[PDB]
Amino acid sequence: MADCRAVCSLNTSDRCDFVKRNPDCHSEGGYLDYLKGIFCYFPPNLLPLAITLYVFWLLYLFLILGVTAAKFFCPNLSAISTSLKLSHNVAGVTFLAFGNGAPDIFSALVAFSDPRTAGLAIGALFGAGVLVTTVVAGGITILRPFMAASRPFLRDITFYMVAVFLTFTALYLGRITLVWALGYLGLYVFYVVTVIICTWVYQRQTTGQILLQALNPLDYRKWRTQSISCKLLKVAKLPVEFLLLLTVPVVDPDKDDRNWKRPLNCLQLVISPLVLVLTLQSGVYGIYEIGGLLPVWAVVVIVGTALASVTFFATSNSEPPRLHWLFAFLGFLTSALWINAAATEVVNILRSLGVVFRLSNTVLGLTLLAWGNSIGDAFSDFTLARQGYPRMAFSACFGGIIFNILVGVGLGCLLQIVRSHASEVKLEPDGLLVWVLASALGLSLVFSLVSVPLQCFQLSKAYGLCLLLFYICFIVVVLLTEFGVIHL
Amino acid sequence: MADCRAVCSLNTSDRCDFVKRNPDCHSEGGYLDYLKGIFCYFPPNLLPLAITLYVFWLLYLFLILGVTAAKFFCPNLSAISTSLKLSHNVAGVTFLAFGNGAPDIFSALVAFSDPRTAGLAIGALFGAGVLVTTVVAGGITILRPFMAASRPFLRDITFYMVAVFLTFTALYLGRITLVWALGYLGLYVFYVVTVIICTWVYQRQTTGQILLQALNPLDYRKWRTQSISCKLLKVAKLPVEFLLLLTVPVVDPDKDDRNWKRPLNCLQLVISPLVLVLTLQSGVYGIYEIGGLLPVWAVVVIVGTALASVTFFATSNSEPPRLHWLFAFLGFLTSALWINAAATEVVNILRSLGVVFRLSNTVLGLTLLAWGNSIGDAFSDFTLARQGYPRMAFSACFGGIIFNILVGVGLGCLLQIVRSHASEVKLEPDGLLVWVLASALGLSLVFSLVSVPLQCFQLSKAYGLCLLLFYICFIVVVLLTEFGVIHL
Amino acid sequence: MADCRAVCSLNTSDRCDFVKRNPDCHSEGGYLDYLKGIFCYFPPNLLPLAITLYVFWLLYLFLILGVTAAKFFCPNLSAISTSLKLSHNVAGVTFLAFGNGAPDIFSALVAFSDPRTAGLAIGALFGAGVLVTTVVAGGITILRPFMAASRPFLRDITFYMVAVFLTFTALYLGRITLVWALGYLGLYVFYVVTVIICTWVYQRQTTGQILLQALNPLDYRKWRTQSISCKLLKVAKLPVEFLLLLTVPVVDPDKDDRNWKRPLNCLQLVISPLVLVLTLQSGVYGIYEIGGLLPVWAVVVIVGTALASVTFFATSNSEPPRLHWLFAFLGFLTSALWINAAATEVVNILRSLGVVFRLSNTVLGLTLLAWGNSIGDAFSDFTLARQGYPRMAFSACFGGIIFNILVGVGLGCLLQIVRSHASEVKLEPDGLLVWVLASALGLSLVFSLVSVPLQCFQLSKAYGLCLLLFYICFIVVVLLTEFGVIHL
């Protein structure tokens, strides 16, 4: 019954027996068993190969998550938002917020679902908070000096500090009960209402050819125009976006036809329910048999092909039907399931690396999960600042993290409480590194709250350079205390 | 004979017996016994109420100190200074310096008078030094870029570093003997002489209506003009300044009549000696009886009313007599006694909070005493910079702390040695937080000494932002080591 | 057989017996025995005098090293470089690099030659790296904003980071074997080749009167023109440069006659071989007798005077002979031997101070050796920036440290391996301060690598102020952990 963190203190011939009958480290969900693979699929000689290969697979999964969220998830959420006839700011605080922060939220939802990994979620949430408010905001001001917006800044910084200190309290007590989770969700509702009300009160005051081009991930002219590095990224993510364009339908509101592609969409109307049944709960309910008479994948593919022929006959190949926002909805679902599968694999990899090297969940979440999840927003915000709109970038910077922390903790803990039939989610402490992380986030927030108003909201290079120096120093201190030079 | 820091390890029914016969924490001065009140006047259920109420009382006492020093003490010192026909710079380095730094000096004088509290004085002096040279000077440069004055800066920084390192030596040896205290006062005399000589060598090279308006603390037009927050502060300090205008006489040199208010002043000529006899040594001498025939408060009120009628008859209600600078002197005395009473109460509150929560004198004096004492200069210096005179603000910033440390340690230790009949004041060490505070002050001074000349005395936003970041980090480290995450 | 760090725990009457028969601290090179002197030449009463005197002697030796390198070593290297008809950039990366970094390299060569002192070399190399990339580069940007050169910066920063991480690996393994040393030298060769190839591909894309004036170290007009401080430095280094001008010949390429001074040079053609034989290995091979018939100093002085008369007769007193670049070579040798003697004395002083005060080699090399060695580079680079060429200063800043670390570790360890007949140089760890130093250098490099490109290579005051603050904080942390307040 030994904890399988004790697998590196065994004779190398008996690590198979341990890994294959110790139940302490069996992935809660997923497809690949990374720890049987790392220990006795590869020969003990070449352990560094297994770990280098796992790190490259982690990086490619982060690319998968970013590409899926930016190009397929968020436009479908926007299609639904426009279909419901909402304004710009309510949309940008609810639907576009969900779309922009998808990777963090799904990562927290997966980590909170298992007692052994719940320390990854806390580390990743606080670490992403520390990273976005120092490196991204600072870099935005270094790239371009601008005059920041007062009211969004003060609103966002105040709400974020309240949410953060509430989470420190929950960490200290050592638990999250469903009253606390419902409190997180209630605070989010109050934030959306205050944004709406403040912005209102201040405003008043041949088929086959089009199928082949539809499935074609790449355009000749742009690819011939970009540099070498952009070509390299495009060829890196070509398989990802081929599977995406093949299996998720995207409704786009700016277009005249609204990306209506009659053969492609009427074929995904068969392809996508199969992806749902195979991906939901990693397939257990997919292969489950009802009654022993009608198999499950068979019935879903049969009904899918029936209704795909039904819609193919009923529509012509020029003008969309009157109800393809349901294509928007169906695309939302299967984009969400793709993100869920990628996040489950990422969390399993990080857990296995923690078992092998006897690392802590806090440092793994603090560094690798946080950076991998924040690469997307960093890229988006820096591009927006360089184009000539740094007010928008600095606003979105502080606007995203509130949604992330609040919805992530709320939903993740609530769903764990519901499926587990428990009354609380225990937050066991991983040493005293969690309090170093907490104090780093706290002081960062305090520095921004004092500095930006005192500059009269005129931000420049000095502010960003100070924040960048602070982040480098914090990371060095974390690494030095994790590996045992400075012990607390 | 147990130390009453051991009162929180007793059965809650026996905390009365301890607090009322343990002599370890029977404070030797003041009016209110905060520790009997916190333990068994309030029911043990609602201890947080007692402490919230004590924190609000601390804040109001800091407001009392600031209002009394700025409006009543310093103008009387200036009235005496002008009456003696002094120049601007000698006055600004002696009399106006005393007036501007009153709260720090009286706080140190009170803390040094008791072996159990002498750690508050060291913490407060070093902490105010760290705060003024990072947050106030930095904020001055952030608000407005300017070209600093070379000679005042170099003079002040050199003198301050000598005084600070001398105090580190005294701390290391663990004592202050009266030779050291007289040395502090001698260094102050040398500093004043060098300022005089350098500035010279570089320059050469119905009655009732006026009584009611005299007692009226508030003016209609200004109050109607200010915002909500200023109205709130005015109504907060109306009782304070009513008692002040009632009991301390102010002679003002710019006015044509020199705030001569015949009925008000000839009535304070009775009111003020009573305040002196009731406030001196918290009243022990006041109620003491001489000979058993003539009571003390009676004789002072009798002589006061006699001489008040005598001066009322002898003067007319338009032109001051030829000797009301004696009103300036009498106002100086009773302003000083008000400040002494407020500082005694503040020190007793901090000591009680240290006993209850088992905190150290160093951290309490490092933060609460230092911030409460420095709010005044912060406000004055930031207003001066925003008005368009940041050279003056940056000069006064480094000019005040020399007076504070030098006169505070000198006088406080000298008076304790005199009343105690001892030969030294023992400086017992409160752990290794005092050396963290010492090194923070040292590095702050070294950074300013290198940076300002290297910029060619052209100061801007980057300097101040670096200093602000350093102060936030230092406070976080102090809090983290006090509460036990990082132990030394 | 006790370690003589245990000499301060003995009765003061028996410290002579220990110091004169303990072989643990009998230094194996140099002229003065600093530890016999500090313990029982001076009376035990006045130990502070011995140490103050030793600190002044250390400072004067650092001045000796700087004056010898800048005025006598480097011009001779340049004379050889021009004589071989090289271009500007190859010369500036090989010969002028050697000349500019002489003190660091000779210091490392001396420290690595003894197991007891090899910790001084690591500390000094890493500490000089930390100092040059924070204080010198930062000060250059504070003095003058400029647009930095991209390609030199990126080349230099990349090569330096590779060299530094390679040395951390060698430190972790605990050894340097001659394969590693040859690897250091091979990396240096690759760096020189890449600089050459990149710059090429981007470019294509009465006798007695002249003798007395020759020996005259001082000029009247300049000395009458400078200030008091410059006069003080000139009189401080007059004896140094008198011995230098007397015993080392300098060939200078800009001059019309090329500093050809017929009597002075034909006399140094006797004087200099004597200095070589007396300075090489501190004189052991000098006084060694061959055969017992011809003494060594006698034969060298005899042959020297013979060939000096021979060259005096053969040449006239106006035009140089056709081969005085051999004077350049002979001057190179004896300048190198002067630098070697001064560096040996400096290392012996630091070792004795470590034994007396029980300090570590890491902190001694981190601060005193690093600062003393880098004063020259800082003076040269700050003067160059103030004159109006800050691109050149910022280039030389990062270009010097690569040569320093790479050639210093390579040659020092290689020569120790060769003379010792061993297979490796053991790098024993002095606690956990070496890892604090390593992490400081690492983060500094990372900050510069991120910040400078992000600013678009437009450098100003904010960058330098951040770097200066970081260096002050790092030094305070080092001092606080060495003296035991913060223990790791």
Residue numbers in the entry:
A (entry chain B), B (entry chain A), C (entry chain C): 50 to 254, 300 to 582
The authors write:
As a key mitochondrial Ca2+ transporter, NCLX regulates intracellular Ca2+ signalling and vital mitochondrial processes. Here we report the cryogenic electron microscopy (cryo-EM) structures of rat NCLX in cytosol-facing (intermembrane space) and matrix-facing conformations, with and without Ca2+. Each NCLX protomer contains twelve transmembrane helices and two sets of helical hairpins/bundles roughly parallel to the membrane. The structure comprises a transport domain, which mediates NCLX trimer formation at the centre, and a gate domain, located on the periphery without contacting other protomers.
We selected rat NCLX (83% sequence identity with human NCLX) for cryo-EM due to its favourable biochemical behaviour. Under Ca2+-free conditions, we also observed distinct assemblies, including all three protomers in matrix-facing; one or two in cytosol-facing; or all three in cytosol-facing conformation. By contrast, the structure determined at pH 7.4 without Ca2+ displays a combination of cytosol- and matrix-open, or all matrix-open, conformations within a trimer, compatible with NCLX potentially in mixed protonated states. This pH-dependent shift in conformational state distribution aligns with our finding that NCLX operates a H+-coupled transport process. Furthermore, we found that, for each protomer, the overall structure of this putative proton-bound NCLX is similar to the Ca2+-bound form, with the N-terminal half of TM2 rotating around the Ca2+-binding site along the interface with the gate domain. This rotation is presumably caused by local changes in the Ca2+-binding site configuration, whereas the domain-interface residues of TM2 remain staying on the interface.
